[PDB]
Scaffold this active site. Sequence first.
Site, PDB file in Angstrom:
ATOM      1  CD  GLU A  31      -2.497   1.774   0.403  1.00  0.00           C
ATOM      2  OE1 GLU A  31      -2.436   2.976   0.097  1.00  0.00           O
ATOM      3  OE2 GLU A  31      -3.250   0.948  -0.156  1.00  0.00           O
ATOM      4  NE  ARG A 112     -12.347   3.149  -0.342  1.00  0.00           N
ATOM      5  CZ  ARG A 112     -11.124   2.961   0.122  1.00  0.00           C
ATOM      6  NH1 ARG A 112     -10.802   3.351   1.342  1.00  0.00           N
ATOM      7  NH2 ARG A 112     -10.223   2.377  -0.640  1.00  0.00           N
ATOM      8  NE  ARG A 194     -22.847   9.885  -0.848  1.00  0.00           N
ATOM      9  CZ  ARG A 194     -22.203   8.742  -0.947  1.00  0.00           C
ATOM     10  NH1 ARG A 194     -20.883   8.777  -0.968  1.00  0.00           N
ATOM     11  NH2 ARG A 194     -22.865   7.624  -1.105  1.00  0.00           N
ATOM     12  CG  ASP A 316     -13.018   1.491  -8.619  1.00  0.00           C
ATOM     13  OD1 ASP A 316     -13.918   0.636  -8.827  1.00  0.00           O
ATOM     14  OD2 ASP A 316     -13.120   2.511  -7.919  1.00  0.00           O
ATOM     15  CB  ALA A 329     -16.755  -1.149  -4.196  1.00  0.00           C
TER      16      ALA A 329
HETATM   17  C1  LIG Z   1     -13.571  11.202  -3.432  1.00  0.00           C
HETATM   18  C2  LIG Z   1     -14.190   9.866  -3.740  1.00  0.00           C
HETATM   19  C3  LIG Z   1     -15.546   9.686  -3.622  1.00  0.00           C
HETATM   20  C4  LIG Z   1     -16.143   8.443  -3.898  1.00  0.00           C
HETATM   21  N1  LIG Z   1     -17.496   8.326  -3.755  1.00  0.00           N
HETATM   22  C5  LIG Z   1     -18.036   7.164  -4.005  1.00  0.00           C
HETATM   23  C6  LIG Z   1     -19.424   7.059  -3.848  1.00  0.00           C
HETATM   24  O1  LIG Z   1     -20.141   7.971  -3.488  1.00  0.00           O
HETATM   25  N2  LIG Z   1     -19.923   5.814  -4.144  1.00  0.00           N
HETATM   26  C7  LIG Z   1     -19.186   4.714  -4.558  1.00  0.00           C
HETATM   27  O2  LIG Z   1     -19.770   3.654  -4.789  1.00  0.00           O
HETATM   28  N3  LIG Z   1     -17.838   4.833  -4.708  1.00  0.00           N
HETATM   29  C8  LIG Z   1     -17.302   6.000  -4.440  1.00  0.00           C
HETATM   30  N4  LIG Z   1     -15.936   6.147  -4.573  1.00  0.00           N
HETATM   31  C9  LIG Z   1     -15.133   4.996  -5.030  1.00  0.00           C
HETATM   32  C10 LIG Z   1     -14.880   3.893  -4.019  1.00  0.00           C
HETATM   33  O3  LIG Z   1     -14.106   4.405  -2.943  1.00  0.00           O
HETATM   34  C11 LIG Z   1     -14.162   2.727  -4.700  1.00  0.00           C
HETATM   35  O4  LIG Z   1     -14.951   2.347  -5.820  1.00  0.00           O
HETATM   36  C12 LIG Z   1     -13.931   1.489  -3.836  1.00  0.00           C
HETATM   37  O5  LIG Z   1     -12.984   1.779  -2.809  1.00  0.00           O
HETATM   38  C13 LIG Z   1     -13.417   0.295  -4.624  1.00  0.00           C
HETATM   39  O6  LIG Z   1     -12.200   0.656  -5.306  1.00  0.00           O
HETATM   40  P1  LIG Z   1     -10.932  -0.304  -5.286  1.00  0.00           P
HETATM   41  O7  LIG Z   1     -10.831  -1.012  -3.989  1.00  0.00           O
HETATM   42  O8  LIG Z   1     -10.853  -1.085  -6.542  1.00  0.00           O
HETATM   43  O9  LIG Z   1      -9.786   0.802  -5.293  1.00  0.00           O
HETATM   44  P2  LIG Z   1      -9.461   2.067  -4.371  1.00  0.00           P
HETATM   45  O10 LIG Z   1     -10.547   2.267  -3.385  1.00  0.00           O
HETATM   46  O11 LIG Z   1      -9.085   3.168  -5.285  1.00  0.00           O
HETATM   47  O12 LIG Z   1      -8.187   1.558  -3.558  1.00  0.00           O
HETATM   48  C14 LIG Z   1      -6.911   1.650  -4.197  1.00  0.00           C
HETATM   49  C15 LIG Z   1      -5.846   1.495  -3.141  1.00  0.00           C
HETATM   50  O13 LIG Z   1      -4.571   1.317  -3.790  1.00  0.00           O
HETATM   51  C16 LIG Z   1      -3.638   2.255  -3.279  1.00  0.00           C
HETATM   52  N5  LIG Z   1      -2.709   2.576  -4.354  1.00  0.00           N
HETATM   53  C17 LIG Z   1      -2.941   3.345  -5.462  1.00  0.00           C
HETATM   54  N6  LIG Z   1      -1.913   3.428  -6.266  1.00  0.00           N
HETATM   55  C18 LIG Z   1      -0.940   2.659  -5.645  1.00  0.00           C
HETATM   56  C19 LIG Z   1       0.381   2.350  -6.002  1.00  0.00           C
HETATM   57  N7  LIG Z   1       0.966   2.791  -7.112  1.00  0.00           N
HETATM   58  N8  LIG Z   1       1.080   1.550  -5.165  1.00  0.00           N
HETATM   59  C20 LIG Z   1       0.482   1.105  -4.057  1.00  0.00           C
HETATM   60  N9  LIG Z   1      -0.747   1.337  -3.615  1.00  0.00           N
HETATM   61  C21 LIG Z   1      -1.420   2.126  -4.466  1.00  0.00           C
HETATM   62  C22 LIG Z   1      -4.478   3.433  -2.799  1.00  0.00           C
HETATM   63  O14 LIG Z   1      -3.771   4.194  -1.844  1.00  0.00           O
HETATM   64  C23 LIG Z   1      -5.684   2.700  -2.207  1.00  0.00           C
HETATM   65  O15 LIG Z   1      -5.464   2.270  -0.870  1.00  0.00           O
HETATM   66  C24 LIG Z   1     -15.329   7.368  -4.302  1.00  0.00           C
HETATM   67  C25 LIG Z   1     -13.948   7.567  -4.423  1.00  0.00           C
HETATM   68  C26 LIG Z   1     -13.376   8.788  -4.138  1.00  0.00           C
HETATM   69  C27 LIG Z   1     -11.890   8.972  -4.267  1.00  0.00           C
END
Ligand SMILES: Cc1cc2nc3c(=O)[nH]c(=O)nc-3n(C[C@H](O)[C@H](O)[C@H](O)COP(=O)(O)OP(=O)(O)OC[C@H]3O[C@@H](n4cnc5c(N)ncnc54)[C@H](O)[C@@H]3O)c2cc1C
EC number: 1.-.-.-
Length: 430
Positions: A31, A112, A194, A316, A329
Amino acid sequence: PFEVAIVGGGITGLALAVGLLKRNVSFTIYERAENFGELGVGITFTPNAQRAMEALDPCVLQSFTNVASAPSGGTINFVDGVREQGSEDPRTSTAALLFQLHVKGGYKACRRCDFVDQIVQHIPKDCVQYRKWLDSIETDHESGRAVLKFRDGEIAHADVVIGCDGIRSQVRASMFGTDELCPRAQYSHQLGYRGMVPLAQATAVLGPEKTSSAVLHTGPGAFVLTIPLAEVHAMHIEAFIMDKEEWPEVQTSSDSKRYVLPATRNEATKAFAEFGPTVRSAVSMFPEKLEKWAVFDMLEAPVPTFAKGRVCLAGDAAHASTPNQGGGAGFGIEDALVLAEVLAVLAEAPNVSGIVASEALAVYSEVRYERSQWLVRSSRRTGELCTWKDRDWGLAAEELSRDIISRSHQLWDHDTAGMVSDALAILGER
Ligand SMILES: Cc1cc2nc3c(=O)[nH]c(=O)nc-3n(C[C@H](O)[C@H](O)[C@H](O)COP(=O)(O)OP(=O)(O)OC[C@H]3O[C@@H](n4cnc5c(N)ncnc54)[C@H](O)[C@@H]3O)c2cc1C
């Protein structure tokens, strides 16, 4: 030893990590941040997502149910937000009902950070390395294994690399590049506004009938959900406004700074000025100061596959979606399930060649690609329906109902268990 590197500890990566832990597969989460932070955004998880959580492990679903809230039952009323009739006082008006969407198995929402905090309890501390900001992935000359290289100047080795590193994935850049035409997320032309308000205050303004159930208010160019969340004694108001303009680009590694701006209070007021009193009243309950979230998705510039060599994408990073049918998600959890099951097969094998590792990830992609692309497109279409983009659906309720019910069924009633056995069958072939 067979080693899984998970890049990114978001919902996708953490869910996968628990699935691997419970299947006795070795992994490390890398991370970039010092911790998993405290982003408070609300995510709604649909039935298909909850089934995939359970299938990863019951503790994943328990982590979720421990922090999630919902209205009473799984019926959502779709209304015409413009043609509410009877009064300017919502307490005595008649909502213009189009149809009811019943969600089999229900849906729930959580913050989250609360879900993250529950999940992380189940992962040993010695499986998570913070301050590991992945910059590149290379191949080791001697072994052929993946070499991860982090911005701190250190390296790690793995048999497979799972890019769970989100909408601006560095793993995706490694696989498919960074040029102007590369796979990437782009603005979906929808802005999220929201807020949560005390449920009794919402009832005082709107009346009990209109705060008794989840309601999605459709209308021209914007829509809003009013969802009474029982366990937190709050009404959640979630508006989406369509925005034909481009989203201003900010240079930042912070996704909040990239995709959020302060919102001038009049923006929501103007968007809903031609709606009925229930919508204008709800929108007026937003704090004078609020933020707007620019929703990006991978509809226009999708990745061509989720796997290349010993590297793959999940969540994502693979298929960032609008949230119009539930949080994207949920599909990161489906991705995680398939990966957990396939990687368990490799973890058991005496030896795993680079060829066998690569073929495994390719199987993951074969099972998840089409469905994942479908969600991105279906969710965008859902937004178009709810904002009356092509047609005034207020005046074609039955048609609207058939369309939304069909796409909801394909998403929410998916054969989770069949997906797993399909994966294991194809893995066999390869
Ligand atoms: C401001 C904001 C508002 C949101 N609002 C909503 C909402 O209202 N409704 C909704 O459904 N979703 C929302 N989301 C999205 C939601 O948070 C994500 O869809 C969900 O967390 C699932 O994404 P994921 O786990 O695939 O990736 P992410 O949640 O993006 O997690 C990615 C992780 O990888 C880490 N990372 C990134 N790049 C690197 C790297 N190079 N090396 C190591 N680690 C790295 C990041 O620090 C993070 O911990 C929002 C996101 C943001 C930023």
